[PDB]
Design a protein around this ligand. Structure first.
Ligand SMILES: *[C@H]1O[C@H](CO)[C@@H](O)[C@H](O)[C@@H]1O
Lengths: 323, 6
């Protein structure tokens, strides 16, 4: 069709979101990642010890291997995967493309093999950063956008509940008010943008924040000055070297965190900042430092409170409060 | 957590 929708479900602690997709004759759970442009899956070529417990892709009669083509990717958390390439039909909630480049994994790192629900990733960043060699391939979105009613996809990730990915249209029953747009900087292949300011509780700052919208990143990673300022308002909070981040008494009161985009205020409920248990009655925070990255990453912790529209016509990004 | 293609 010219439009389509599909359910996406979080894994424990909302660490990542999984979406069922049909690759060839196989239905797999993939992590939709706007932070990368490679669609790769666990397959019959993946060593048995590494694909144990995962559903996988087996090239069928509709598959055609791209001779001499290879891919290799490294992610921000150090994880990785590599293999060869096939072209096959891929269907996402009714929307299909018969010649999508499917990257078959021959090697996959431990971060991926342990989480049995994750059978690969579907990249939604700009195709300019696809890693296939010698010739780069296009993302599923770039291949189908011309056939969609509108060249866009929107996402409504939810906290410990079913959410949705919309293709070709915006679902007015998923958000309230109107959508506010901001320009996108895709010079580095990502959905980069700049927020006009932020607020810790009611303390608002005119300071600007530049970063990327990444469905494939768990937390909200920002500059140390903002991170430190946030936890100064959280009694009992302190940096824990063993866990690699700020933690605080599970009973502590957490202030809301907001980012200003134009005349719109995107607010992250303090309750969502309580990310995970770390023992001793303490909780690991949903907001941590972007140290090293070089820029901020608006991950799931942030995205799960908004209905976000990724518009390729601009490129532009749209935000609205979830309904 | 994870951080997806630096
Ligand atoms: C895409 O979305 C449109 C609008 O909801 C539907 O009419 C179509 O059938 C498809 O689900």
């Amino acid at each position: 069709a010219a439009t389509g929708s599909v359910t996406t479900n979080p894994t424990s602690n909302d660490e990542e979101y999984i979406t069922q997709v049909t690759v060839g004759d196989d239905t797999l759970g993939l992590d939709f990642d706007t932070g990368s442009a490679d669609l790769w899956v666990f397959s019959s070529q993946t060593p048995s010890s590494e694909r144990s417990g995962h559903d996988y892709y087996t090239p069928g009669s509709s598959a055609q291997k791209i001779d001499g083509a290879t891919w290799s990717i490294s992610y921000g958390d150090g994880s990785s995967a590599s293999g060869d390439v096939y072209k096959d039909k891929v269907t996402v909630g009714g929307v299909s493309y018969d010649s999508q480049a499917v990257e078959s994994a021959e090697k996959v790192s431990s971060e991926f093999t342990q989480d049995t629900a994750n059978d690969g990733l579907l990249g939604l960043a700009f195709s300019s950063i696809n890693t296939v060699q010698p010739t780069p391939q296009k993302t599923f979105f770039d291949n189908v956008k011309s056939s969609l009613s509108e060249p866009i996809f929107a996402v409504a990730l939810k906290h410990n509940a079913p959410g949705v990915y919309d293709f070709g249209y915006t679902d007015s029953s998923k958000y309230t008010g109107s959508i506010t747009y901001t320009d996108v900087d895709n010079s580095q292949g990502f959905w980069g943008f700049t927020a006009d300011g932020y607020s810790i509780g009611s303390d608002s700052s005119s300071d600007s924040i530049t970063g990327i919208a990444d469905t494939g990143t768990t937390l909200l990673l920002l500059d140390d000055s903002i991170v430190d300022a946030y936890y100064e308002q959280v009694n009992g909070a302190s940096y824990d070297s063993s866990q690699g981040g700020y933690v605080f008494p599970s009973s502590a009161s957490l202030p809301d965190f907001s980012v200003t985009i134009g005349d719109y205020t995107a607010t992250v409920p303090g309750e969502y900042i309580s990310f995970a248990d770390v023992g001793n009655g303490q909780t690991f925070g949903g907001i941590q430092s972007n140290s090293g990255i070089g820029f901020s990453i608006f991950g799931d912790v942030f995205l799960k409170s908004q209905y976000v529209v990724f518009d390729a016509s601009g490129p532009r990004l749209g935000f609205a409060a979830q309904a | 957590x994870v951080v997806x293609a630096x």
